[PDB]
Design an enzyme around this catalytic site. Structure first.
Site, PDB file in Angstrom:
ATOM      1  N   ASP B  25       0.827  -1.209   0.000  1.00  0.00           N
ATOM      2  CA  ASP B  25       0.000   0.000   0.000  1.00  0.00           C
ATOM      3  C   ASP B  25       0.861   1.260   0.000  1.00  0.00           C
ATOM      4  O   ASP B  25       1.229   1.779   1.064  1.00  0.00           O
ATOM      5  CB  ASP B  25      -0.910  -0.039   1.238  1.00  0.00           C
ATOM      6  CG  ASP B  25      -1.950   1.054   1.258  1.00  0.00           C
ATOM      7  OD1 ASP B  25      -1.904   1.970   0.405  1.00  0.00           O
ATOM      8  OD2 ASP B  25      -2.827   0.986   2.156  1.00  0.00           O
ATOM      9  N   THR B  26       1.147   1.782  -1.192  1.00  0.00           N
ATOM     10  CA  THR B  26       2.035   2.942  -1.303  1.00  0.00           C
ATOM     11  C   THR B  26       1.404   4.222  -0.745  1.00  0.00           C
ATOM     12  O   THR B  26       2.130   5.182  -0.456  1.00  0.00           O
ATOM     13  CB  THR B  26       2.499   3.177  -2.742  1.00  0.00           C
ATOM     14  OG1 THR B  26       1.366   3.349  -3.606  1.00  0.00           O
ATOM     15  CG2 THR B  26       3.362   2.006  -3.239  1.00  0.00           C
ATOM     16  N   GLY B  27       0.081   4.234  -0.590  1.00  0.00           N
ATOM     17  CA  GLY B  27      -0.619   5.356   0.027  1.00  0.00           C
ATOM     18  C   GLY B  27      -0.677   5.329   1.536  1.00  0.00           C
ATOM     19  O   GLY B  27      -1.291   6.215   2.143  1.00  0.00           O
TER      20      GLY B  27
HETATM   21  C1  LIG Z   1      -8.581  -0.880   2.516  1.00  0.00           C
HETATM   22  C2  LIG Z   1      -7.153  -0.602   2.104  1.00  0.00           C
HETATM   23  C3  LIG Z   1      -6.755   0.866   2.278  1.00  0.00           C
HETATM   24  C4  LIG Z   1      -6.813   1.316   3.740  1.00  0.00           C
HETATM   25  C5  LIG Z   1      -7.609   1.737   1.358  1.00  0.00           C
HETATM   26  N1  LIG Z   1      -7.174   3.161   1.419  1.00  0.00           N
HETATM   27  C6  LIG Z   1      -6.007   3.530   0.580  1.00  0.00           C
HETATM   28  C7  LIG Z   1      -4.808   3.785   1.513  1.00  0.00           C
HETATM   29  O1  LIG Z   1      -3.602   3.868   0.724  1.00  0.00           O
HETATM   30  C8  LIG Z   1      -4.952   5.048   2.363  1.00  0.00           C
HETATM   31  C9  LIG Z   1      -4.820   6.357   1.574  1.00  0.00           C
HETATM   32  C10 LIG Z   1      -4.941   7.558   2.489  1.00  0.00           C
HETATM   33  C11 LIG Z   1      -3.847   8.373   2.749  1.00  0.00           C
HETATM   34  C12 LIG Z   1      -3.968   9.468   3.598  1.00  0.00           C
HETATM   35  C13 LIG Z   1      -5.168   9.774   4.193  1.00  0.00           C
HETATM   36  C14 LIG Z   1      -6.270   8.970   3.943  1.00  0.00           C
HETATM   37  C15 LIG Z   1      -6.162   7.875   3.091  1.00  0.00           C
HETATM   38  N2  LIG Z   1      -3.905   5.028   3.362  1.00  0.00           N
HETATM   39  C16 LIG Z   1      -4.104   4.831   4.654  1.00  0.00           C
HETATM   40  O2  LIG Z   1      -5.158   4.656   5.239  1.00  0.00           O
HETATM   41  O3  LIG Z   1      -2.876   4.813   5.392  1.00  0.00           O
HETATM   42  C17 LIG Z   1      -2.957   4.897   6.807  1.00  0.00           C
HETATM   43  C18 LIG Z   1      -1.794   4.056   7.280  1.00  0.00           C
HETATM   44  O4  LIG Z   1      -0.674   4.936   7.155  1.00  0.00           O
HETATM   45  C19 LIG Z   1      -1.101   6.277   7.380  1.00  0.00           C
HETATM   46  O5  LIG Z   1      -0.593   7.139   6.368  1.00  0.00           O
HETATM   47  C20 LIG Z   1      -1.666   7.640   5.559  1.00  0.00           C
HETATM   48  C21 LIG Z   1      -2.952   7.437   6.350  1.00  0.00           C
HETATM   49  C22 LIG Z   1      -2.611   6.283   7.281  1.00  0.00           C
HETATM   50  S1  LIG Z   1      -8.429   4.197   1.329  1.00  0.00           S
HETATM   51  O6  LIG Z   1      -7.923   5.518   1.182  1.00  0.00           O
HETATM   52  O7  LIG Z   1      -9.139   3.979   2.553  1.00  0.00           O
HETATM   53  C23 LIG Z   1      -9.423   3.882   0.064  1.00  0.00           C
HETATM   54  C24 LIG Z   1      -9.147   4.361  -1.219  1.00  0.00           C
HETATM   55  C25 LIG Z   1      -9.998   4.065  -2.298  1.00  0.00           C
HETATM   56  C26 LIG Z   1     -11.141   3.299  -2.098  1.00  0.00           C
HETATM   57  C27 LIG Z   1     -12.078   2.971  -3.242  1.00  0.00           C
HETATM   58  O8  LIG Z   1     -11.549   1.875  -3.992  1.00  0.00           O
HETATM   59  C28 LIG Z   1     -11.425   2.820  -0.826  1.00  0.00           C
HETATM   60  C29 LIG Z   1     -10.575   3.106   0.240  1.00  0.00           C
END
Ligand SMILES: CC[C@H](C)CN(C[C@@H](O)[C@H](Cc1ccccc1)NC(=O)O[C@H]1CO[C@H]2OCC[C@H]21)S(=O)(=O)c1ccc(CO)cc1
Lengths: 99, 99
Positions: B25-27
Site C-alpha cells: 500500500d504505497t498510500g
Molecule cells: C482498505 C485498504 C486501504 C486502507 C484503502 N485506502 C487507501 C490507503 O492507501 C490510504 C490512503 C490515504 C492516505 C492518507 C489519508 C487517507 C487515506 N492510506 C491509509 O489509510 O494509510 C494509513 C496508514 O498509514 C497512514 O498514512 C496515511 C494514512 C494512514 S483508502 O484511502 O481507505 C481507500 C481508497 C480508495 C477506495 C475505493 O476503492 C477505498 C478506500
C-alpha cells in the site's frame, strides 16, 4: 520515472482546469478525489478505509492527466483528506511496483 | 519481483511464525495489521485514514518477511479493513513505483 517511497508518492495531476497533487496509491482499487463539482452523470457510493466510510459520487470516463500521461476512467469524488490515484488509473499510465 | 496493478497487490507475509496476506500500500505511511497478538512492549497510538481516526497498538522492531524480503520495523495493530504494508517497510525491501 522511478518514484521511491521515502516520502509520500505525490504527483501532479490535471482534471479539466484544476491541477492537484495526488498519491499514487497501490492500496486503492479506485481513484478518489477531493470534493469538486464535475460535470455529468454520477451515482452515490460508500467507500471504506481506516476510520470507517465516506460518501462519494462516482463519475465515469473522466479524463485525468497524471504527470503528462493520459488516463480516462472512473473517479470517485468526496470528502477525502488526500487525492488518491488508484489502480484503475495506475494501470493506464503503466505503473508497476518493483523490488 | 515486478508487480502489476490490474489485481490487488496482495502478498504473503511471515510475522511471528504466522503466514498472513497483506496489501502492498504505497498510500500508507504506516504498516497496519488486523487484530493479532505480538509479544513485548507496545504504545497506544492514534492514526487517521480516509474515514477518520482509530486507536492502534504500536509495536517497534518487528521482523516481517514480505515476499521473501526481510524488514524489521514498526507495526501498528488495530481495526484496519485489511492488513496493509506501508512505506515504512516498503522502503526497507527496496520498493519503488515505476512508469
Ligand atoms: C482498505 C485498504 C486501504 C486502507 C484503502 N485506502 C487507501 C490507503 O492507501 C490510504 C490512503 C490515504 C492516505 C492518507 C489519508 C487517507 C487515506 N492510506 C491509509 O489509510 O494509510 C494509513 C496508514 O498509514 C497512514 O498514512 C496515511 C494514512 C494512514 S483508502 O484511502 O481507505 C481507500 C481508497 C480508495 C477506495 C475505493 O476503492 C477505498 C478506500
Amino acid at each position: 520515472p522511478q518514484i521511491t517511497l521515502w516520502k509520500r508518492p505525490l504527483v501532479t495531476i490535471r482534471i479539466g482546469g484544476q491541477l492537484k497533487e495526488a498519491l499514487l496509491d497501490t492500496g486503492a482499487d479506485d481513484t478518489v478525489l477531493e470534493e469538486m463539482n464535475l460535470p455529468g452523470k454520477w451515482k452515490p457510493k460508500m467507500i471504506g478505509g481506516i476510520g470507517g466510510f465516506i460518501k462519494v459520487r462516482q463519475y465515469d470516463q473522466i479524463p485525468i492527466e497524471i504527470c503528462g500521461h493520459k488516463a480516462i476512467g472512473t473517479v470517485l469524488v468526496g470528502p477525502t483528506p488526500v487525492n488518491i490515484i488508484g489502480r484503475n488509473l495506475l494501470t493506464q499510465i503503466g505503473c508497476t511496483l518493483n523490488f
